[PDB]
Amino acid sequence: DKLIFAVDIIRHGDRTPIVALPTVNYQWQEGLGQLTAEGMQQEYKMGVAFRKKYIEESHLLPEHYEYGTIYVRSTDYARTLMSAQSLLMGLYPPGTGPTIPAGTSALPHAFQPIPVFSAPSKYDEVIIQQVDRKEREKLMEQYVFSTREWQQKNNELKDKYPLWSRLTGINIDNLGDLETVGHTLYIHQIHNAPMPEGLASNDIETIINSAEWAFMAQEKPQQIANVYSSKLMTNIADYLNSGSMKKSKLKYVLLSAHDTTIASVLSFLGAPLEKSPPYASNVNFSLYDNGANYYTVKITYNGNPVSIPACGGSVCELQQLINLVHDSKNS
Amino acid sequence: HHMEDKLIFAVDIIRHGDRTPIVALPTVNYQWQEGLGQLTAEGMQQEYKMGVAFRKKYIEESHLLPEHYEYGTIYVRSTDYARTLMSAQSLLMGLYPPGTGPTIPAGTSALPHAFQPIPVFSAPSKYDEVIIQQVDRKEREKLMEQYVFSTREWQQKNNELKDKYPLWSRLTGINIDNLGDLETVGHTLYIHQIHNAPMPEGLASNDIETIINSAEWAFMAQEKPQQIANVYSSKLMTNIADYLNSGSMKKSKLKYVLLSAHDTTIASVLSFLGAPLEKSPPYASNVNFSLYDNGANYYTVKITYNGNPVSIPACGGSVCELQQLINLVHDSKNS
């Protein structure tokens, strides 16, 4: 079987908190919500791994960047654009970039520029589905907040919210608030930045674990994933469909999304994550040609097979994956 | 006590670097390795060089920007084209070069050669709130017929050349019915000359120059009318005026805006300012708006094109007071 097309959804690398802790005397050098140095290296290493699999092993892609063969699209965020660029430095490293005729390398160290296309979230025809916020809070309380598990988890924790509010300096009125605090505390642990003084190690771990749980609860309902990921999954199906049709130089599509993108797509496919996607996580759609006009799609999460209920495994026939996507999109 | 003038904000509109033709010549056996309408190796170096110049000015001399990239201080926006995206990225490799990139905590460089990633934001032309004003083809042809084809000069140049359209069409493999079609052929022929690509068999050296010269004339004619510029450039100029206005309030970290535009973007902006171009903007062309703090909440804007002062009739020079420029922009937008 021959690899003839691939789509990669990546999340961005290690980042600084969206929300700083007012009670902590620590400045994030990179600024808030920004890709860190480790974040860049993570994406670059993933780009290096992609070069090995798509260029050295399969020859899906040429050794040097060839216009028309790849399409790279990012969401409208510094961290996703810089993640795409870091990864692409791995896929097409310095030393592969072009040389002026009879001259020197065009850029220092023969770097290879690759266009990273983007659209504002409100105008994104490919990755981001923006929904009227009055309808998101209606979806959330219908399929997430109203559930027995959500209400019960908020109830066990909220007596601690006033203390946690005072110690973190962020008002926590509900589990939704606690989640943002947990995501921040976690980034704080990764980078061994100071924690709020007096906030207990047991509370730190409870708030962080609760934030991950709350994160996954919001991504898990297939009804939520259909609203948010139908547009993205329709575009991925159309790219895989075009890839089988032999007609274009395009062999590879790279979409620099976030953790919500990845969790939402896997949930859309009926394989919701129990755990938050680690930094530079990958959802891959690999299109295989059997030679007897039989096209299959292998779907992986960080290189691991995704068991899709509708397909009974990680491998779907191409038309079957397309119908799954259009069946989900029309709910 | 009394303070020297300080550069407190800048906006650059750049043209992309050297590119392959948009329209190839069917009759010439020369394949553009990069694909059509794409930035070449020479184009990347041109942008990188401009970036090195920008670093000297904005970083080493004025300290408008920090030595190492700081999120929030710079905003880079590109049109939705591979050539403008790759031009911005090449230039940024000059502005924040390998060696200024971040280090991981272990003290190793995050990327090879300590490369510094910089986000280049973009929108499709149809959805661009910053650079591109989209105009329906029919509305464009109405504007062309009112302000460009209506001139005696346009009609006279088309009538003097249209004799050779049948010959030139056969020789180029491109259909030419008018000066507008001819302009496309001349841009392509010019790119052939730049790269010493073969010219179409039988097309005379004199006819080459005439077509290239006619294409430049045709291009400047379409950009010249202020009414055309007001339609295409009102939105861009409004945003640039808002950027400068926000720079004067000095509440925001934003110090620098880079706009990866096209030759039309530059031509249309200068035409909008009442200083329409005579000559086609070369590759890696730059329109600069520099915001100066004169020390007592008096702010001036200097406008330059490729290092030369732009004479703005309404401002009576290259230097405008910030509100006067802001008013010029809004009165043009209200036409």
mmCIF file of N, CA and C in Angstrom, chain A residues 245-288:
data_model
loop_
_atom_site.group_PDB
_atom_site.id
_atom_site.type_symbol
_atom_site.label_atom_id
_atom_site.label_comp_id
_atom_site.label_asym_id
_atom_site.label_seq_id
_atom_site.Cartn_x
_atom_site.Cartn_y
_atom_site.Cartn_z
ATOM 1 N N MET A 245 -8.073 11.666 -6.063
ATOM 2 C CA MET A 245 -8.345 12.065 -7.473
ATOM 3 C C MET A 245 -7.077 12.489 -8.240
ATOM 4 N N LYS A 246 -5.852 12.240 -7.762
ATOM 5 C CA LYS A 246 -4.713 12.090 -8.710
ATOM 6 C C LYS A 246 -4.393 13.387 -9.478
ATOM 7 N N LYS A 247 -5.122 14.487 -9.242
ATOM 8 C CA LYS A 247 -5.276 15.640 -10.184
ATOM 9 C C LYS A 247 -4.326 16.795 -9.859
ATOM 10 N N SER A 248 -3.843 16.895 -8.621
ATOM 11 C CA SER A 248 -3.073 18.073 -8.144
ATOM 12 C C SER A 248 -1.690 17.643 -7.672
ATOM 13 N N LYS A 249 -0.781 18.602 -7.587
ATOM 14 C CA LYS A 249 0.549 18.394 -6.968
ATOM 15 C C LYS A 249 0.411 18.292 -5.441
ATOM 16 N N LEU A 250 -0.717 18.738 -4.872
ATOM 17 C CA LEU A 250 -0.901 18.795 -3.401
ATOM 18 C C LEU A 250 -0.863 17.380 -2.819
ATOM 19 N N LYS A 251 0.043 17.152 -1.877
ATOM 20 C CA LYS A 251 0.228 15.840 -1.203
ATOM 21 C C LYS A 251 0.088 15.943 0.313
ATOM 22 N N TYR A 252 0.095 17.153 0.859
ATOM 23 C CA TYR A 252 0.161 17.339 2.323
ATOM 24 C C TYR A 252 -0.487 18.653 2.768
ATOM 25 N N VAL A 253 -1.356 18.524 3.748
ATOM 26 C CA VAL A 253 -2.032 19.668 4.394
ATOM 27 C C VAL A 253 -1.701 19.667 5.878
ATOM 28 N N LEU A 254 -1.184 20.787 6.354
ATOM 29 C CA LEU A 254 -0.815 20.961 7.770
ATOM 30 C C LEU A 254 -1.691 22.056 8.348
ATOM 31 N N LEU A 255 -2.443 21.718 9.401
ATOM 32 C CA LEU A 255 -3.349 22.691 10.070
ATOM 33 C C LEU A 255 -2.863 22.929 11.504
ATOM 34 N N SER A 256 -2.347 24.131 11.782
ATOM 35 C CA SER A 256 -1.844 24.480 13.137
ATOM 36 C C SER A 256 -3.016 24.896 14.033
ATOM 37 N N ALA A 257 -3.679 23.918 14.659
ATOM 38 C CA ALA A 257 -4.831 24.191 15.551
ATOM 39 C C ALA A 257 -4.363 24.198 17.011
ATOM 40 N N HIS A 258 -5.295 23.996 17.949
ATOM 41 C CA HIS A 258 -4.967 23.980 19.399
ATOM 42 C C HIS A 258 -5.437 22.659 20.022
ATOM 43 N N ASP A 259 -5.378 22.561 21.353
ATOM 44 C CA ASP A 259 -5.802 21.342 22.079
ATOM 45 C C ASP A 259 -7.309 21.125 21.872
ATOM 46 N N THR A 260 -8.088 22.206 21.819
ATOM 47 C CA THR A 260 -9.557 22.127 21.663
ATOM 48 C C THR A 260 -9.839 21.528 20.294
ATOM 49 N N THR A 261 -9.061 21.915 19.288
ATOM 50 C CA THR A 261 -9.210 21.420 17.917
ATOM 51 C C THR A 261 -9.051 19.919 17.947
ATOM 52 N N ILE A 262 -7.964 19.469 18.568
ATOM 53 C CA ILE A 262 -7.624 18.027 18.550
ATOM 54 C C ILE A 262 -8.692 17.233 19.315
ATOM 55 N N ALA A 263 -9.019 17.667 20.528
ATOM 56 C CA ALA A 263 -9.999 16.981 21.389
ATOM 57 C C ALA A 263 -11.334 16.942 20.633
ATOM 58 N N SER A 264 -11.698 18.044 19.991
ATOM 59 C CA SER A 264 -12.999 18.194 19.301
ATOM 60 C C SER A 264 -13.085 17.246 18.098
ATOM 61 N N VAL A 265 -12.018 17.152 17.330
ATOM 62 C CA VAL A 265 -11.964 16.248 16.157
ATOM 63 C C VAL A 265 -12.064 14.801 16.619
ATOM 64 N N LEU A 266 -11.327 14.407 17.653
ATOM 65 C CA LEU A 266 -11.371 12.990 18.101
ATOM 66 C C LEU A 266 -12.763 12.681 18.646
ATOM 67 N N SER A 267 -13.328 13.600 19.409
ATOM 68 C CA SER A 267 -14.715 13.489 19.919
ATOM 69 C C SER A 267 -15.666 13.415 18.714
ATOM 70 N N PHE A 268 -15.450 14.228 17.695
ATOM 71 C CA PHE A 268 -16.310 14.207 16.487
ATOM 72 C C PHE A 268 -16.303 12.803 15.884
ATOM 73 N N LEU A 269 -15.153 12.126 15.927
ATOM 74 C CA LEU A 269 -14.978 10.800 15.287
ATOM 75 C C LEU A 269 -15.484 9.683 16.196
ATOM 76 N N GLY A 270 -16.037 10.039 17.356
ATOM 77 C CA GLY A 270 -16.541 9.072 18.345
ATOM 78 C C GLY A 270 -15.430 8.444 19.182
ATOM 79 N N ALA A 271 -14.274 9.098 19.284
ATOM 80 C CA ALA A 271 -13.161 8.633 20.144
ATOM 81 C C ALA A 271 -12.703 9.762 21.057
ATOM 82 N N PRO A 272 -13.582 10.297 21.936
ATOM 83 C CA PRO A 272 -13.200 11.438 22.764
ATOM 84 C C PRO A 272 -12.054 11.055 23.699
ATOM 85 N N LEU A 273 -11.169 12.018 23.958
ATOM 86 C CA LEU A 273 -10.008 11.844 24.852
ATOM 87 C C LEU A 273 -10.506 11.855 26.291
ATOM 88 N N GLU A 274 -9.871 11.062 27.137
ATOM 89 C CA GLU A 274 -10.044 11.178 28.610
ATOM 90 C C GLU A 274 -9.063 12.213 29.161
ATOM 91 N N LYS A 275 -7.920 12.399 28.492
ATOM 92 C CA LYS A 275 -6.842 13.308 28.966
ATOM 93 C C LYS A 275 -6.597 14.455 27.969
ATOM 94 N N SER A 276 -6.194 15.611 28.488
ATOM 95 C CA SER A 276 -5.790 16.805 27.695
ATOM 96 C C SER A 276 -4.673 16.431 26.726
ATOM 97 N N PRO A 277 -4.751 16.866 25.452
ATOM 98 C CA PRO A 277 -3.694 16.591 24.483
ATOM 99 C C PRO A 277 -2.387 17.251 24.912
ATOM 100 N N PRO A 278 -1.285 16.504 25.034
ATOM 101 C CA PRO A 278 -0.007 17.137 25.352
ATOM 102 C C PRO A 278 0.428 18.152 24.286
ATOM 103 N N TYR A 279 1.404 18.975 24.638
ATOM 104 C CA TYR A 279 1.941 19.984 23.698
ATOM 105 C C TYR A 279 2.409 19.280 22.420
ATOM 106 N N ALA A 280 2.188 19.943 21.288
ATOM 107 C CA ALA A 280 2.564 19.476 19.933
ATOM 108 C C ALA A 280 1.946 18.113 19.655
ATOM 109 N N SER A 281 0.765 17.834 20.183
ATOM 110 C CA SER A 281 -0.018 16.648 19.786
ATOM 111 C C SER A 281 -0.430 16.765 18.309
ATOM 112 N N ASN A 282 -0.673 15.625 17.686
ATOM 113 C CA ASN A 282 -0.834 15.448 16.226
ATOM 114 C C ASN A 282 -2.117 14.635 16.028
ATOM 115 N N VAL A 283 -3.069 15.062 15.222
ATOM 116 C CA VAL A 283 -4.047 14.080 14.667
ATOM 117 C C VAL A 283 -3.739 13.951 13.179
ATOM 118 N N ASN A 284 -3.416 12.743 12.751
ATOM 119 C CA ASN A 284 -3.025 12.454 11.350
ATOM 120 C C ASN A 284 -4.111 11.675 10.586
ATOM 121 N N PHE A 285 -4.374 12.113 9.362
ATOM 122 C CA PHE A 285 -5.197 11.389 8.377
ATOM 123 C C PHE A 285 -4.280 11.027 7.211
ATOM 124 N N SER A 286 -3.963 9.748 7.068
ATOM 125 C CA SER A 286 -3.066 9.241 6.005
ATOM 126 C C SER A 286 -3.895 8.486 4.970
ATOM 127 N N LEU A 287 -3.754 8.887 3.722
ATOM 128 C CA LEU A 287 -4.546 8.313 2.626
ATOM 129 C C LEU A 287 -3.670 7.288 1.917
ATOM 130 N N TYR A 288 -4.169 6.056 1.858
ATOM 131 C CA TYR A 288 -3.448 4.924 1.232
ATOM 132 C C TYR A 288 -4.157 4.456 -0.026
#
